[PDB]
Amino acid sequence: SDVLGSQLGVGVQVANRLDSQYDGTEIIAYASLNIAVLTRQNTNRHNNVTSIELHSPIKSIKIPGRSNLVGIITENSFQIFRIESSEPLYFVEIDDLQVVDFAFNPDLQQFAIIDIKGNWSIGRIPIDNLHGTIFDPESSWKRIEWFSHFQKILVFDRSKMIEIDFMNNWQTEVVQASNIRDYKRIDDKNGILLTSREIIIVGASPVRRISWKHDLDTTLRITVQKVLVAFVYSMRHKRIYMHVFSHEIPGGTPTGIETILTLDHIDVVDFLVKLRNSSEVYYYALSN
Amino acid sequence: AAAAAAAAAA
Amino acid sequence: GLLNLGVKDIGEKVIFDGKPLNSEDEISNSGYLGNKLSVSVEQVSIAKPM
Amino acid sequence: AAAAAAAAAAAAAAAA
C-alpha cells in the first residue's frame, strides 16, 4: 500500500491534536485557544465550518463513541461540547494546571485526563465530578490508552510507563532512559507501542520487546490502526511512519514539511490525519 | 521507638 | 385584558429619512420613499408596585 | 507555597 495526501487544513496555528469524525466527514484540529472543524467531504472547502474557542493551546480532543460529544483538554478546564443540532455543554475544572492527553471509556461514562502534575484524573461525565485519581508518575503524564479488554489502562509519563487496574491500583511499570511522549495499545492485544526517539513495542506482561529505529528525533505521537495490523508514529523529524504489528516492518513513510505533532486514524482504517509544526493538518487516504 | 518519641512531644 | 389590544390598535409608527438608494439603474432611486425604521409594540404589562 | 507548607507542618505538630 501507500498513503496519498487528499487534503490540507490551514489551521494557521501548531496543531497539537487532531481527531476525525465517525463514516467521518469532519476533522477537528486543535491549535492555539481554538478547535477548528473542517468538512472534508467538501473537497474546495478552504476554511473551517465551525470553530470552538476552548482556551490556551490545545493538547487533546476526543470524540465520544457515538460521536455526539467532543472533549477538549488544554489548561485547567476541560470543555465538553455537544455536536448535535456545537455549543459548550459543560466544563470540568481540575486543580492541575494543564492536561496533556485524554481517553474515553469504552462505556462512554468516564473520561481519563492526563495531568501535568502526573496524576490521572477520572471524571464521571453525566455529575462532572472527579471520581478518582491515580497518582504514580512523579512528572506530567504525556499519553494514555485503554487495554483491549477495557479492564486496564496504560499511561506514559516523563520517563516511565505504568499500567493501571480499572478497579484502582497500579499493576506494573516500565522504566526508560528517556521521556515517553506517546503510546498505543494494540486493539488485538498483547502489544504496547511506546513513543521515545526509538519506538518500542512491549510485549504485554512478556519480557521480550521490539525496538525500531526510523526516527532521527522524538516521537511525538503514535496510533494503531483499528484492524491492530499496523500502526503509525509521528516524529519531530518531520516523518510519519507506518509499521507492521509487533516486530515494525516499514510499510511506508511520508515526509512532511515540518514536525508531526499529532495523528489520528479513522475508525475504517481509511484515512490518516496528522498535525504539523507548519501550523496545518494533513489528510491522507490509505490505499489498499 | 520513633513513634513513642512523637507521642512524648505532643 | 385591555392594554395588549390597545397597543395593537396604534401598533406601528414609521419615520423615513431620505437617502439615496444607491442601487443600479432604476427609477426606484428617484422615488426612494426609502428605508423604514419601522417601530412597533407587541406587549405592555405592569409588573408590580413592590 | 512555602507558607502553605509551614502551615501544614504547624497543623501536624498540633495533631501530634
Binding site: 486543580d95 472527579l130 471520581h131 | - | 409588573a47 408590580k48 | 507555597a1 507558607a3 502553605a4
Partner: protein, 168 residues
C-alpha cells in the same frame, strides 16, 4: 507574591472542599464550607442537598442576590428545585413563577407550564373517584387543561394531558 498565611489557606481550603465534594463529607462540607466563607455556591447548594441535617433555603438566598440588570445561572435552578420539592401551598409558587417571567421577558415559561400540569394530575384522580358528582371539579379541570395547553403552544406532553382528562 502569594499572601503569607491567608492566600495559601484559602487555596488549600478550596482544594479540601473539592475533595469533600468528591467524597461526601457531610461534616467536612459543614466545616470546610464555613471556613471558605471568609459568585459561586453550587457546591454549597450541592452539599445541603447531598448531606442533610430541608436543603431549600440557601439556593433562595443565592438567587436573590445580583438581580438588578443565557438568562441567569443562579435562578433557572431554583425554580426546578421547587417543583421537585413539591412532588406547603403551590399556587404561591406558580404566582412567583409568573412574577419572575413578568420581570424578565430554557424560557421559564416552559417550566411554568409544566408546574400547572402537576396540579392537573392530582385534580384528575380526585375527580375520578366517587367518594359521585357531575359539574364542579370536572369543569375546573377542563379549564386548567386549556390553560396548560395555551402556554405550551406559545407531542408527548400533549398526549399525556389528554389521557389525564379522560381518566378524570
Amino acid at each position: 507574591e502569594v499572601r503569607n498565611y491567608r492566600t495559601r489557606h484559602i487555596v488549600t481550603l478550596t482544594d479540601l472542599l473539592h475533595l469533600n465534594v468528591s467524597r461526601h463529607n457531610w461534616s467536612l462540607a459543614y466545616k470546610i464550607f464555613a471556613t471558605l466563607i471568609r459568585s459561586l455556591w453550587g457546591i454549597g447548594v450541592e452539599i445541603l442537598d447531598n448531606l442533610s441535617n430541608g436543603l431549600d433555603f440557601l439556593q433562595w438566598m443565592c438567587q436573590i442576590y445580583s438581580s438588578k440588570s443565557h438568562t441567569a445561572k443562579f435562578a433557572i435552578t431554583y425554580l426546578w428545585s421547587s417543583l421537585i420539592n413539591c412532588q406547603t401551598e403551590n399556587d404561591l409558587l406558580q404566582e412567583l413563577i409568573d412574577k419572575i417571567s413578568e420581570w424578565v421577558l430554557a424560557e421559564v415559561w416552559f417550566i411554568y407550564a409544566s408546574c400547572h400540569l402537576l396540579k392537573a394530575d392530582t385534580l384528575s384522580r380526585q375527580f375520578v373517584n366517587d367518594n359521585d358528582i357531575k359539574i364542579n371539579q370536572v369543569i375546573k379541570h377542563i379549564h386548567y387543561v386549556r390553560t396548560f395547553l395555551k402556554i405550551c403552544l406559545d407531542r408527548l406532553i400533549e398526549n399525556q394531558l389528554k389521557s389525564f382528562e379522560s381518566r378524570l
